[PDB]
Design a protein around this ligand. Structure first.
Ligand SMILES: CC(C)C[C@H](NC(=O)[C@@H](O)[C@H](N)Cc1ccccc1)C(=O)O
Ligand SMILES: [Yb+3]
Ligand SMILES: [Zn+2]
Length: 610
């Protein structure tokens, strides 16, 4: 079983493995460059190893030092989104298992796809700049030379010099701070990550950060203006951690902190070890969007302990995590809620499959990313089709109690390892040996390798979903003279979640007549709702139903925050509506330079500009 990572240009794990990274760098806001040395302790896996290749992307290399002497290295031609391979000539051939340290002096480009540099005006405080990284999937190579593949796991230590007024934090345990001996206007923050991790989990943030403790092993960090709101919004964090520990085994990372980033953070959450990054769009005021914390917490087992070997097997990370996530919510709020969320996930899968096309390669559970930018293939498929498969197996094999026994042994079995779908499947068969008959009823080829919706849809309790569907159907089948019958009391017994699902169901049948949409605003006043998931769906419904009043509202939401999940579909809907098309494009052209590099690239592609 020889498997290569087609998204990486580095020497594979079968040739050599990075065991540790000692990073020493300075964050230069005036130049928007990170400069320093990356000392990689590498272990040869081959006899007579004389060179090796690392991934790099828009990096400027000053020199490479081994045994205190500069050595030869060469940068190959850039290969689009993969960057440029860096081949290093070892000064002395290595035997199998020999380890050496390679010190690389480098500097990042202001354009690094792993970073977003924000001016003071783009922050809450308005006085200090801010920097944040986002390495998943393959952007770590845009910060430092490395074997940018999740098939290799390393520990790391780091020293980061930053303006003394600011604070640095990383996906690691804080290991002290001191004034920078080479520059008194700076402070050096130190970090240590003793647990081997794939490099996509390396993370850094530098800004005017403050903290507040919200649990025995949790601090929430953000700019001062957001601290109080965040402490409240995420107060269930420790109870979610305890439940996750009960599902996957002991939490091995020490601390579990949360960092609430500026509005341009591209995801709802990112499971960086010891410090989960989250979007400020989660600050609904009622803790209603907390499934995102449950999800990132779950990656502490599925994703960070047991890791997908290559991005072709991404579903292993997300599928199991969404499955654990819904179990935490099920324990906190009831089995019927778990089913409600499961069913909602299926609807999101329908949307993705419909958007790409039912035969499209990106709708396969296991995808082949050779020549495909992972940012482009990213969708809800690995999450929901992966979740649907596990939920299907759960029902097939005897229920949640039994399948949760499998998930815990799976984590235990593959801790600190990087695996493929076959490893997963092999273990599933081993664990459920007394039920191979049942496992053999599964159409494996269709589930794992065929595009479109899964061959089978799991059974779902519909208790909580029914009222959402009923109301959605009343609006869709209503004619003009039925509009008067709608009234605020329709929403009387719906939770924010059900309100959201009601909108999701209606959005699947959009457009609705303009008159229906105006009436909906008249009786439900959806424009007043600040919950970002609800606002997102409501505005999409308004724009697709061609209500010009919603144009400025949609443009505003699309630009004041940058969570891709919201910004991309909003710009896309605005561009597809002829009345807002020109302004959408113009708005994008205008904000482009100040957006997240990756998000700007994807929106540009979606709008067919550039
Ligand atoms: C509750 C979750 C579905 C929220 C979701 N976040 C995730 O799934 C994170 O764990 C992912 N690690 C986000 C990600 C995936 C691929 C490349 C870069 C970043 C998101 O939408 O941000
Ligand atoms: Yb009628
Ligand atoms: Zn995830």
């Amino acid at each position: 079983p020889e498997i290569v990572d087609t998204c990486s240009l580095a020497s594979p794990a079968s040739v050599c493995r990075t065991k540790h990274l000692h990073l020493r760098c300075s964050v230069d806001f005036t130049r928007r460059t990170l400069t320093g040395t990356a000392a990689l302790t590498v272990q040869s896996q081959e006899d007579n190893l004389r060179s090796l290749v690392l991934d790099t992307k828009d990096l400027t290399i000053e020199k490479v030092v081994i045994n205190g002497q500069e050595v030869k290295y060469a940068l190959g031609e850039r290969q689009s989104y993969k960057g440029s391979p860096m081949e290093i000539s070892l000064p002395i051939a290595l035997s199998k298992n020999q380890e050496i340290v390679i010190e690389i002096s480098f500097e990042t480009s202001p354009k690094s796809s792993a970073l977003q540099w924000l001016t003071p005006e783009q922050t809450s405080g308005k006085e200090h700049p801010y920097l944040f990284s986002q390495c998943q999937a393959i952007h770590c190579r845009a910060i430092l030379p490395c074997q940018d593949t999740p098939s290799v796991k390393l520990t790391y230590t780091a020293e980061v010099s930053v303006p003394k007024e600011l604070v640095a934090l990383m996906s690691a345990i804080r290991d002290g701070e001191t004034p920078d001996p080479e520059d008194p206007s700076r402070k050096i923050y130190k970090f240590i990550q003793k647990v081997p991790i794939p490099c996509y989990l390396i993370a850094l943030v530098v800004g005017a950060l403050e903290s507040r403790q919200i649990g025995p092993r949790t601090l929430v960090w953000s700019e001062k203006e957001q601290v109080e709101k965040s402490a409240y919004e995420f107060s269930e964090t420790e109870s979610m951690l305890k439940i996750a520990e009960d599902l996957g085994g002991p939490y091995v990372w020490g601390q579990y902190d949360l960092l609430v980033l500026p509005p341009s953070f591209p995801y709802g959450g990112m499971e960086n070890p010891c410090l989960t990054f989250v979007t400020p769009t989660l600050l609904a005021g009622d803790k209603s969007l907390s499934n995102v914390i449950a999800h990132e917490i779950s990656h502490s087992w599925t994703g960070n302990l047991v890791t997908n070997k290559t991005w072709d097997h991404f579903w292993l990370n997300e599928g199991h995590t969404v499955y654990l996530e819904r179990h935490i919510c099920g324990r906190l709020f009831g089995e019927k809620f778990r089913h409600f969320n499961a069913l909602g996930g299926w609807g999101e899968l329908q949307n993705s499959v419909k958007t790409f096309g039912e035969t499209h390669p990106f709708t396969k559970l296991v995808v082949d990313l050779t020549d495909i930018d992972p940012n482009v293939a990213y969708s809800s498929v690995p999450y929901e089709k992966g979740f649907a498969l596990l939920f299907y197996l759960e029902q097939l094999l005897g229920g949640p109690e039994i399948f949760l026994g499998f998930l815990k042994a799976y984590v235990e079995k593959f801790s600190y390892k990087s695996i493929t779908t076959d490893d997963w499947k092999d273990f599933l068969y081993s664990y459920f040996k007394d039920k191979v008959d049942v496992l053999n009823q599964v159409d494996w080829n269709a589930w794992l390798y065929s595009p479109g919706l899964p061959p089978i849809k799991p059974n779902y309790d519909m208790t909580l979903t029914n009222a959402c569907i009923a109301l959605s159907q009343r609006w869709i089948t209503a004619k003009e003279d039925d509009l008067n019958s709608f009234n605020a009391t329709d929403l009387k017994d719906l939770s924010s979640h059900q309100l959201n699902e009601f909108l999701a169901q209606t959005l699947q049948r959009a457009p609705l007549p303009l008159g229906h949409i105006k009436r909906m605003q008249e009786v439900y006043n959806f424009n007043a709702i600040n919950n970002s998931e609800i606002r997102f769906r409501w505005l999409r419904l308004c724009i697709q139903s061609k209500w010009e009043d919603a144009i400025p509202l949609a443009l505003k939401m699309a630009t004041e925050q940058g969570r891709m999940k919201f910004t991309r579909p909003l710009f896309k809907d605005l561009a597809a509506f002829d009345k807002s098309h020109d302004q959408a494009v113009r708005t994008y052209q205008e904000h482009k330079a100040s957006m997240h590099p990756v998000t700007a690239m994807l929106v540009g592609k979606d709008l067919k500009v550039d």
